[PDB]
Each structure stands twice: as C-alpha cells, then as structure tokens.
Spike glycoprotein
Amino acid sequence: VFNATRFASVYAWNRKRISNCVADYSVLYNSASFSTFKCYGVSPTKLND
Amino acid sequence: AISSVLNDILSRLDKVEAEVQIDRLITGRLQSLQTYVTQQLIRAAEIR
Ligand SMILES: *[C@@H]1O[C@H](CO)[C@@H](O[C@@H]2O[C@H](CO)[C@@H](O[C@H]3O[C@H](CO)[C@@H](O)[C@H](O)[C@@H]3O)[C@H](O)[C@H]2NC(C)=O)[C@H](O)[C@H]1NC(C)=O
C-alpha cells in the first residue's frame, strides 16, 4: 500500500481493499518519513485499540 | 457529535477532540433533563 513501485494519477486514483488481517498503525506513525498523518474520526494513537 | 455513545467517543479520541465532541452531549443531554424536570414541575402543579 505505502511502498508500491508506482502510484496512480489522481483522476484515476487507485483504491485497494484491506480485509481479514491484523493492523498495527504504530509502524506508520513511528515512521519519520511522513509529512502528514491527520486522522478525521479517530485519534492516531487510538488506532491500535 | 460523532456518536450517541460516550465510550465510543472516548475510546476513539484524545483529550481535546473528545472535549469538543463530549460537550455537545453534555449540552443536549442537560437540556433534556432541564426540559424533563420542568415538565414534571408543571405536571406536579397539575396533580397538586
Ligand atoms: C518501504 O520498505 C522498506 C523495506 O521493508 C522499509 O524500510 C525498512 O524499515 C524497517 C523498520 O520497519 C527497518 O528494520 C530495521 O530497523 C532498524 C534499523 O536500524 C534495526 O535496528 C531493526 O533490527 C530492523 O531490522 C529496515 O532496516 C528498513 N529497510 C530499508 C531498506 O529501508 C520502509 O519503512 C518502507 N516504507 C514504507 C512507507 O512503508
């Protein structure tokens, strides 16, 4: 998801469905790479709960 | 607000975004008791 070789043009924006798996969002939040990580119906810590 | 269950706000939000949400419920609910208790004080004057 976050590491594909290429992304789509924003007119055709690709959508990948995520299901039947464990999510640990700390892996992304601890990643010093991301300029932006804003949450809009939850708080980014509470994702893990 | 996002949800009519308190703990489904509180598990999903931090100390500040929850203060913005929760006070909505504190308002609405308070106005629901402030209504109900008025309605009873007047009915009570009817039954009195
Ligand atoms: C894109 O894919 C990269 C490869 O999977 C990934 O980089 C890797 O990130 C992990 C941490 O999740 C690193 O793991 C090591 O971290 C420290 C390094 O000092 C070690 O002490 C640990 O024992 C552990 O082995 C990898 O070293 C790192 N590899 C590379 C080549 O960067 C990126 O995080 C991925 N990016 C995104 C956006 O998902």
